[PDB]
Write a structure and sequence with these properties.
homodimer; 180 residues; mainly alpha; 3-stranded antiparallel beta sheet; two-stranded antiparallel sheet; 10% strand; HTH_MarR-typ (chain A); transcription regulation (chain A); DNA-binding (chain A); MarR/SlyA-like (chain A)
Chain lengths: 180, 156
Amino acid sequence: YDVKEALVFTQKMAQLSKALWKSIEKDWQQWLKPYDLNINEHHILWIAYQLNGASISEIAKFGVMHVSTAFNFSKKLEERGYLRFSKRLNDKRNTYVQLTEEGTEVFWSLLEEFDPTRNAVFKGSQPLYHLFGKFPEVAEMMCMIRHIYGDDFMEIFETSLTNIDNDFESVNGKLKKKAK
Amino acid sequence: PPYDVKEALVFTQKMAQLSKALWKSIEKDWQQWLKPYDLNINEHHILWIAYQLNGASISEIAKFGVMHVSTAFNFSKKLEERGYLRFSKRTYVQLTEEGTEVFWSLLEEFDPTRNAVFKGSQPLYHLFGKFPEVAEMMCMIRHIYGDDFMEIFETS
């Protein structure tokens, strides 16, 4: 490698990457502000929703947070009444976490407030969607993440929509809980 | 119907996830690079910007550093109290002699084999003979942040 080419590249990725995440983070915290949840809490709820219960280990992995952060925030969610801890006989090693009825309700309620026209990443990708007929695949970015984080990490994408498709309908560009 | 709102959601959460993963990895590598110097990422970024631009206003630092203007002021002020930056008027912020030296030292220690994104991107490099353009990503960033923000890249 040319070390000057390597520098240009890594500084380009750092800048693009800070710009993208800060933008998403800001929209995500706006979304959550009426609920007094932070982003990590919502992410924990999301992971337990998507996987039908999740271990602290899966939450740390898929939430891109340390195990202790996953535990700490799950504990806070438990105190809030939004999560409960269980322990699966089949798996003595792990602590699992599951949505309570209150947590599930807050989760559905957040999804019903989801408005893509208020999301800068969605708006930012509309010219590409119109040109290509689909959302951008960002395949180079995905390739890099798969190489840094491994194949395991990537599997979260496969089930991204399973539960949501059965729980919600689209009416007027918004999600609405349907009778499942 | 333009988009399915379900597809929009899926896309949105895919972007959040990839984007957090990519930034956490860069952030972690960038903190290690800065450990011997006891500089914040935001402080290095301010130094970088003042250097690229040959002096920078607090609001240019906020914009190109992707920071609230308050944070940019706070960290510029820390850097000044370190002797790395000086406040001046043509108010703007300029590297001192010491700040320039620290900036240079850091660049001399830059080692791409310790950068996860650099290594994660070798298969692509080996396949295409160049670093990935990530042109979809760049295009989204241009639409969110504007053309003025993107000029910072045209300082290769």
